[PDB]
Amino acid sequence: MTRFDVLTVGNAIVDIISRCNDQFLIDNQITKAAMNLIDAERAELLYSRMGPALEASGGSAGNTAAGVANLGGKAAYFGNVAADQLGDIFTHDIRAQGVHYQTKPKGAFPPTARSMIFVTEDGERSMNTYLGACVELGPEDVEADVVADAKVTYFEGYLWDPPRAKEAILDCARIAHQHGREMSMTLSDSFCVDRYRGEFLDLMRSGKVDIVFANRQEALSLYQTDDFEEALNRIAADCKIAAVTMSENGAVILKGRERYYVNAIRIREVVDTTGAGDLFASGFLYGYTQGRSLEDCGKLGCLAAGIVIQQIGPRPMTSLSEAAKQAGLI
Template identity: 40%
Template sequence: MPVSQPSLDIVAIGDAIVDVIATCDDAFLVEHALPKGQMQLLDTDHANRLYAAMGNARETSGGSAANSMAGIAAMGGKAAFIGQIAKDQLGEIFRHDMRALGVQFDTPALNSGSEHPTGRCLILVTPDAQRTMNTCPGASHQLKAEALDEALIASASILMLEGYLWGPELPRKAMYRAIEIARAAGRKVAFTLSESVCLEGRSEVFAKMIEDGGIDLLFANDHEAMQLAAAPSLGEALAVLAEKVPTLVITRGAEGALGLQDGVGVEIPAIPVAEIVDTTGAGDLFAAGFLTAHCRGHDLRKCLETGAIAAAEIISHFGARPEADLKALVQL
């Protein structure tokens, strides 16, 4: 049982990244050997070269879990974020953006100089709305357990963890510690998967964690679910994962989404969009909508539908932060 009533809906731990978004054609991707529609990690020097070659860009605070917290705040939820930034210009942009959006963010900046600058994701959007992400994690992968605000974690109804931070040793240890804190306070733990979690050497450790009952709610797309479960079909993957995780949420792009909760399955279609401009952050905002509705006590179908509404709004414009009044759109 919780030691006290939660004062926050959700606290997330994830990459503190500044998104740098620009448009380009397919020829630019070929010229710079960038895998279209995929995400790759860059070191600082490579990121600097690519940034210099990009056209006009827009800079906003980003990162998967941070995007979700921004969405939750936009829907009227109480959200907080824990992530590592550096003492530099991009770090100040990130902190200002998060607080301006209504997300509590107080993680102290890392005084790392040029060795570990604030992380950035160079996002190139082609005319077909596909986004190619090139991430330089920088300071975000230096998050230590000692930087966690334990009282903040214990105060939230749900602890949300981001898969992109699962690989590096320091933030993975921090996430383990955060789970201990949340469990001691009687809170739920949600995890948003990423393809990086499914890589060899990472999936085994994560699989053991869900085997041990460490995750209450798992977000994944269909491909990630199949990779994690080592299953040839989505149906078989769901059968494997549903035995270990009480609530599964699977996004399927244009095919909609489905959820499994305590053996009960619900499937919904995607929300029609007049024009898909940029798919950046679609999964992040889906999770935001789902979690906001979940914290309001809604059933699985309503949670999925709320996620779909939030995702549809985000793909109708550039960037991973809502521009329309999400609170009015989801009507919770």
């Protein structure tokens, strides 16, 4: 037996969520649908203009770990918060979901990362992230026994922004592979891909990453193309398994020459897209580590993603395991 199905690694963030009109994004030069990095001064400025908000634990990989636990899988998470109230919230929420979380805060400054997420009327989310304590994550935060004992270790492309997180990831890759485990990454965001295009390709081609998650926008960015079919062929050539999401058009799972298309759930109304990709990865990786077919992994991913976009906030407040049972995915 193994201790963990999925270890995830990412920027530990608390989300600050509000609604806005379309003009707000233009007025404040916020790139729509993207992760916009911001400094402390810009954080203060944007917050001063933001309406009344709700807070909820976030972080892309944090959400993915929570989702795996919610489905009934065994999950762990590495990510660095500060010894402050936001860090206490983050710690509580992830542990309360039944995710192993033991990364120790290093101090009160920089403070715990937060992301001001503006949700427009169409349900799109535009994130504005002050990394704070995330900049401190490094090799010292790798719990080697956890990596050794996890079927899959999954990490964010977003980790390439803070300075030393990549060193922790390279350590994880070494340990995972020495123990016959698999490594997975998400491309995270199309501008993130643009920042780290060559590095991401190298991760895949060198075999440090076995399973890659992308959406359409990320895949097009990765190969600098408007040809989605080219992007699919290239990504299949670059990694052992690729899971590519296409929003309302569902998803496609690629392995060598194999392609498995999955339909998206028909949605009544798109409330807030925050967490869609994260929860697709939850469903996929839960299925993968239970030995399910690639198609069924895709189905579980679409189920989880469809649920999270029908609520405000990034982590499903309902039972994913119950939903999967009703769906005959069990």
